[PDB]
Amino acid sequence: STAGKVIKCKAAVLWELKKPFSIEEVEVAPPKAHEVRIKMVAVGICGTDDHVVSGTMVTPLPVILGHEAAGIVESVGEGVTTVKPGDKVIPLAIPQCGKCRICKNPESNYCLKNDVSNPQGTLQDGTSRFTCRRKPIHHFLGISTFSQYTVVDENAVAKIDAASPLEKVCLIGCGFSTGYGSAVNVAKVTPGSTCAVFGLGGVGLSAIMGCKAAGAARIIAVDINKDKFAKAKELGATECINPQDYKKPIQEVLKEMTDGGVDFSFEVIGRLDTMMASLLCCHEACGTSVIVGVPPDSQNLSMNPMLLLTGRTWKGAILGGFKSKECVPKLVADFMAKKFSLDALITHVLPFEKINEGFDLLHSGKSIRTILMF
Amino acid sequence: STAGKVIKCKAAVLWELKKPFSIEEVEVAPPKAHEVRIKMVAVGICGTDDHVVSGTMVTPLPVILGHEAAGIVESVGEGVTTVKPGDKVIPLAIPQCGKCRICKNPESNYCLKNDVSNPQGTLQDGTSRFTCRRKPIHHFLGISTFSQYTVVDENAVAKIDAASPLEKVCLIGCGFSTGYGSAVNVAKVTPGSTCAVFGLGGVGLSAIMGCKAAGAARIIAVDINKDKFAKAKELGATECINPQDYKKPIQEVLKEMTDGGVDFSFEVIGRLDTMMASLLCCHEACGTSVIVGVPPDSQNLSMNPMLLLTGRTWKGAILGGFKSKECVPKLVADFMAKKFSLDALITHVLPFEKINEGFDLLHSGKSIRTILMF
Numbered sequence: 243s244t245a246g247k248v249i250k251c252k253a254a255v256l257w258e259l260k261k262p263f264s265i266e267e268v269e270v271a272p273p274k275a276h277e278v279r280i281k282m283v284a285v286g287i288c289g290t291d292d293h294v295v296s297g298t299m300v301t302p303l304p305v306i307l308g309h310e311a312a313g314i315v316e317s318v319g320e321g322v323t324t325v326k327p328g329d330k331v332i333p334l335a336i337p338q339c340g341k342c343r344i345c346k347n348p349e350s351n352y353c354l355k356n357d358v359s360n361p362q363g364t365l366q367d368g369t370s371r372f373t374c375r376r377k378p379i380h381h382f383l384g385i386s387t388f389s390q391y392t393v394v395d396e397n398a399v400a401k402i403d404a405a406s407p408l409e410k411v412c413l414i415g416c417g418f419s420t421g422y423g424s425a426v427n428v429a430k431v432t433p434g435s436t437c438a439v440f441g442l443g444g445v446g447l448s449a450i451m452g453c454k455a456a457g458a459a460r461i462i463a464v465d466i467n468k469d470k471f472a473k474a475k476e477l478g479a480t481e482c483i484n485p486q487d488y489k490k491p492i493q494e495v496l497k498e499m500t501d502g503g504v505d506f507s508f509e510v511i512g513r514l515d516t517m518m519a520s521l522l523c524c525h526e527a528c529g530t531s532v533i534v535g536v537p538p539d540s541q542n543l544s545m546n547p548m549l550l551l552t553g554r555t556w557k558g559a560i561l562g563g564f565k566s567k568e569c570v571p572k573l574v575a576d577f578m579a580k581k582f583s584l585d586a587l588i589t590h591v592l593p594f595e596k597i598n599e600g601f602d603l604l605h606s607g608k609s610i611r612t613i614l615m616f
Numbered sequence: 617s618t619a620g621k622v623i624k625c626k627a628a629v630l631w632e633l634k635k636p637f638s639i640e641e642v643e644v645a646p647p648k649a650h651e652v653r654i655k656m657v658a659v660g661i662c663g664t665d666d667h668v669v670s671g672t673m674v675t676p677l678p679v680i681l682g683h684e685a686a687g688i689v690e691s692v693g694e695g696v697t698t699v700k701p702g703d704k705v706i707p708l709a710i711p712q713c714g715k716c717r718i719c720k721n722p723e724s725n726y727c728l729k730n731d732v733s734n735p736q737g738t739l740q741d742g743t744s745r746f747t748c749r750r751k752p753i754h755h756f757l758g759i760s761t762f763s764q765y766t767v768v769d770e771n772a773v774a775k776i777d778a779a780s781p782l783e784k785v786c787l788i789g790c791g792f793s794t795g796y797g798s799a800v801n802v803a804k805v806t807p808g809s810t811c812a813v814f815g816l817g818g819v820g821l822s823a824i825m826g827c828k829a830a831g832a833a834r835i836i837a838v839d840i841n842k843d844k845f846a847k848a849k850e851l852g853a854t855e856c857i858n859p860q861d862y863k864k865p866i867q868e869v870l871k872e873m874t875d876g877g878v879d880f881s882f883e884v885i886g887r888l889d890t891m892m893a894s895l896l897c898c899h900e901a902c903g904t905s906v907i908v909g910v911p912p913d914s915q916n917l918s919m920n921p922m923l924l925l926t927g928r929t930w931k932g933a934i935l936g937g938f939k940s941k942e943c944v945p946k947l948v949a950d951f952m953a954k955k956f957s958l959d960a961l962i963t964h965v966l967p968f969e970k971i972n973e974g975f976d977l978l979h980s981g982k983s984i985r986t987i988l989m990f
């Protein structure tokens with residue numbers, strides 16, 4: 243069998259920054275108390291993974307990235323009770339310990355057990371389960387899904403519908419939920435409102451989805467890559483504009499187009515200039531601007547407090563404000579009920595081994611979501 | 617009588633920055649179409665008035681400041697229908713034209729007819745009604761109340777209960793409403809929550825009032841002036857702390873005493889450092905921080921967007937989010953029904969001529985609100 247013993251398998255290891263992933267053989271130690279070992283089936287490529295590669299988002303190296311996945315439970319550790327061998331699961335990039343001041347808070351989701359605030363690169367108990375040639379490998383967001391097998395904490399995995407198309411539902415682990423929820427939960431987009439979405443990757447496009455589902459009258463998609471416009475309009479964008487086409491700042495362009503500014507703006511890129519423009523594009527007296535994109539480490543904005551004093555609301559969120567373990571299975575249950583489709587987001591599918599090609603596709607601007615099959 | 621003719625009276629004119637006000641004779645032109653001439657009875661001294669004097673809040677000079685007042689209608693111009701001569705009224709520092717996108721949005725109050733965004737120092741028709749020594753004098757926030765008589769736009773004045781104690785209710789024209797609403801309307805403080813209020817002037821203390829009325833469990837008042845602590849506790853503060861007493865930054869001090877941070881932060885001072893500390897002291901995963909204080913002109917904050925990405929909401933508002941013309945009379949109606957007291961906020965009462973003393977009182981930290989009687 244496999245249960246109880248160290249598994250030898252392949253995973254995409256990142257030894258140095260700005261380097262290609264190296265699929266090597268890694269040793270995956272068995273699950274400990276309240277931990278779960280999962281056999282990865284599908285994993286999507288998110289901009290956040292690329293941020294680590296570029297050194298934009300700091301995390302301890304060497305490390306095994308990936309966090310937008312789905313697989314089957316191989317073994318359960320001592321005391322696990324929510325999932326069992328053979329169950330279909332989605333590992334949670336943000337856990338739900340249930341005992342947190344935040345977890346007990348019906349309005350928030352950023353559990354204290356997260357490894358995002360002060361990245362250690364381990365499991366919640368302070369240790370690693372990965373080894374590549376006698377050297378320990380760090381975990382990423384507590385789930386490290388760019389591996390054929392991974393051990394995560396029990397509160398960091400949710401059991402989903404067994405009839406789930408894992409190659410599709412994996413996007414619910416980050417991309418879709420983050421995008422959709424930012425519009426629905428965080429911003430609370432009102433019917434008949436006007437929205438602005440900067441960034442048309444998988445997360446940004448899911449935000450347009452959330453805006454349409456919320457009944458937005460107008461949904462202006464913004465991106466320097468025009469090839470994304472078709473997918474944008476398909477998913478709900480009333481209009482698409484490219485900043486490169488105008489002589490004046492995009493915020494002014496947008497304000498001119500919407501009688502002073504949009505009701506809800508979203509930044510789904512991860513840049514300071516677009517974050518500012520996004521805040522500046524919502525109406526100064528009633529606009530709400532949500533930060534979705536992850537900005538480069540240790541880079542600060544230069545903001546005027548007056549921009550808020552007039553009546554603006556500026557907020558941010560992780561995973562669309564969704565409590566992970568509790569909502570993820572619910573989102574999957576809504577997918578199975580044809581509430582929303584994930585197909586338009588998936589443009590490419592390659593085998594796990596072609597991971598580096600998947601990142602090349604992202605940089606090319608040709609893909610939205612590329613799913614890696616194990 | 618006076619109706620239809622130019623009135624000669626005294627007003628506090630500010631010819632130059634950083635100088636004492638100068639009581640002089642001023643010619644007040646009669647009200648034009650949809651304008652109202654008010655005889656001032658009482659006017660409070662707000663920190664915003666002081667900001668103009670300090671050059672911290674830019675506005676055209678020379679100018680007649682004052683905006684927290686109450687008076688009686690002397691005359692109405694052509695077409696006025698909301699108020700008649702003899703009516704007790706509170707002039708609105710921010711108007712409610714009722715015809716703009718913002719006035720039409722029941723969620724906002726920053727009417728486009730405001731003179732705050734791009735201060736012109738005139739009435740809505742782009743002109744002045746003030747002349748002092750053959751030189752025109754600018755208006756302030758369209759109301760200029762540091763004058764025995766003033767002409768304002770019709771949408772910038774509200775008829776209030778004729779049985780109102782004008783020496784008390786003037787505070788509803790800015791100070792109280794702004795502080796109280798910031799807590800109740802803007803922040804939307806929840807029963808059983810923990811709040812932090814930076815700044816204990818009239819506005820700050822009214823915020824504590826709003827937090828208590830909202831059912832907050834803990835209300836931590838913060839100020840470098842300990843003499844304000846008694847009033848703070850009297851109005852609802854569960855505890856008062858002075859930053860000067862700790863070795864570590866106040867935001868860390870507050871987090872340590874609130875399990876990671878308060879649910880709602882309020883900055884009611886007008887400084888970049890305190891606005892940053894305030895944002896930093898609310899919990900990163902569920903905290904809301906409201907900017908109430910007016911920051912110094914042309915000064916920007918250096919902030920990391922990650923502070924919001926984890927789950928924080930950062931907002932601002934003017935006049936506590938209250939639609940002026942509509943809510944002012946109702947707030948007075950509530951005062952008359954003993955819903956709230958304004959007495960604790962009023963610490964000094966001087967005749968209009970002692971205006972400079974009133975500002976000296978603000979600087980000394982001995983006063984909260986000083987009311988000037990005409």
Ligand SMILES: NC(=O)c1ccc[n+]([C@@H]2O[C@H](COP(=O)([O-])OP(=O)(O)OC[C@H]3O[C@@H](n4cnc5c(N)ncnc54)[C@H](O)[C@@H]3O)[C@@H](O)[C@H]2O)c1
Pocket residue numbers: 287288289290291293416417420440441442443444445446464465466467470485510511512513516533534535536537559560561562604607610925
């Ligand atoms: N808060 C969260 O929970 C959360 C979750 C997932 C992702 N993210 C962050 O969201 C951001 C992007 O998500 P993604 O996975 O869809 O990435 P992506 O790379 O596929 O999308 C980037 C999009 O932005 C566009 N873009 C880049 N520069 C632009 C510019 N200057 N102006 C306009 N458009 C520009 C690109 O053309 C592309 O359409 C990253 O910061 C990612 O880390 C945050």
Ligand SMILES: NC(=O)c1ccc[n+]([C@@H]2O[C@H](COP(=O)([O-])OP(=O)(O)OC[C@H]3O[C@@H](n4cnc5c(N)ncnc54)[C@H](O)[C@@H]3O)[C@@H](O)[C@H]2O)c1
Pocket residue numbers: 551661662663664665667790791794814815816817818819820838839840841844859884885886887890907908909910911933934935936978981984
């Ligand atoms: N947004 C609005 O609609 C609105 C309305 C009215 C006033 N305001 C602004 O709100 C702010 C306060 O108004 P106010 O009339 O109550 O002023 P105030 O002068 O009476 O209050 C300032 C308070 O802050 C305290 N303070 C100063 N420096 C401090 C520090 N470093 N740390 C802690 N406390 C400090 C002072 O001791 C005093 O208690 C001003 O910026 C005013 O312009 C805004």
Ligand SMILES: O=CN(C1CCCC1)C1CCC1
Pocket residue numbers: 288290291309335336358383416536560561
């Ligand atoms: O890319 C995915 N995530 C990023 C990591 C840093 C900010 C959000 C998610 C949210 C769950 C982890």
Ligand SMILES: O=CN(C1CCCC1)C1CCC1
Pocket residue numbers: 662664665683709710732757790794910934935
């Ligand atoms: O001082 C009073 N106000 C200031 C002007 C600029 C910001 C708020 C009020 C709110 C109504 C006018």
Ligand SMILES: [Zn+2]
Pocket residue numbers: 288289290291309310416417
């Ligand atoms: Zn992601």
Ligand SMILES: [Zn+2]
Pocket residue numbers: 337338339340341342343344345352353354355
């Ligand atoms: Zn938790």
Ligand SMILES: [Zn+2]
Pocket residue numbers: 662663664665683684790791
């Ligand atoms: Zn004021």
Ligand SMILES: [Zn+2]
Pocket residue numbers: 711712713714715716717718719727728729
């Ligand atoms: Zn208006």
